[PDB]
Amino acid sequence: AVGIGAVFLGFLGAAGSTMGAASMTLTVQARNLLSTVWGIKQLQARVLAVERYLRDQQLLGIWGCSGKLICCTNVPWNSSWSNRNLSEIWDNMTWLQWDKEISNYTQIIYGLLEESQNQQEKNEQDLLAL
């Protein structure tokens, strides 16, 4: 019980785990997203990585989920996008299969989130005016 060391899973160990189990280790994966002609190529790669990180951060911030790894929203879940229950999603499926199933309904959800966040901001501004 005392004097024994412990070592935990690595970067992508939870790729095969369930969604519920994989959602408990988002930090480990989030950490690594940041860190003559060959110098040009390496610098271009670094700039591209930085640009991708900044774009992802901006996309998160525009929805009001800035600075959070898990963030609930106000947009209802349309039944057309999926028809499975929570039992068969968070304890039976994995993230890769979920993305493969849902990848055809991505942009509309983003637009709905954007409009919902804008409406919430406007409502808050109106509320604070009193």
């Binding site: 055809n104 309904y105 942009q107 509309i108």
Partner: protein
């Protein structure tokens, strides 16, 4: 200016598959547009076949003709194709590919209205 060009075989045999392709130039097809397939024949006049959504690939078809149609869209080639199965003599007609939409401001008033109604292509069904 937006231009629509229909293409496909000019003749087809009964019970075969009729494939037509409408190519669009001047506007991207992946936008929020409903690309519509219509046909005109003597006796029946104009008859709307169906439509497909560029962005979400959603498709709606005429109930009368049923499941004999399938609509597809290709963004790389900027085109949309109609595939009508089990053709018959009644399907001989001039096919039009078109789109109707409006240009407005975000949560405001309207600016303009747009339709194009391309030239169309004649198709005859016979063995």
């Amino acid at each position: 200016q937006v231009q629509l060009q229909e293409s496909g075989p000019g003749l087809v045999k009964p019970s075969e598959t009729l494939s037509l392709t409408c190519a669009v130039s001047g506007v991207s097809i992946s936008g929020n547009y409903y690309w519509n397939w219509i046909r005109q024949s003597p006796g029946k006049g104009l008859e709307w076949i169906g439509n497909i959504h560029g962005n979400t690939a959603a498709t709606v078809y005429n109930p009368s003709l049923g499941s004999r149609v399938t609509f597809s869209r290709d963004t790389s080639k900027n085109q949309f194709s109609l595939r009508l199965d089990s053709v018959t003599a009644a399907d001989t007609a001039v096919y039009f590919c078109a789109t109707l939409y409006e240009f407005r401001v975000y949560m405001g008033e309207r600016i303009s209205y747009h339709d194009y109604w391309g030239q169309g292509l004649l198709v005859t069904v016979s063995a």
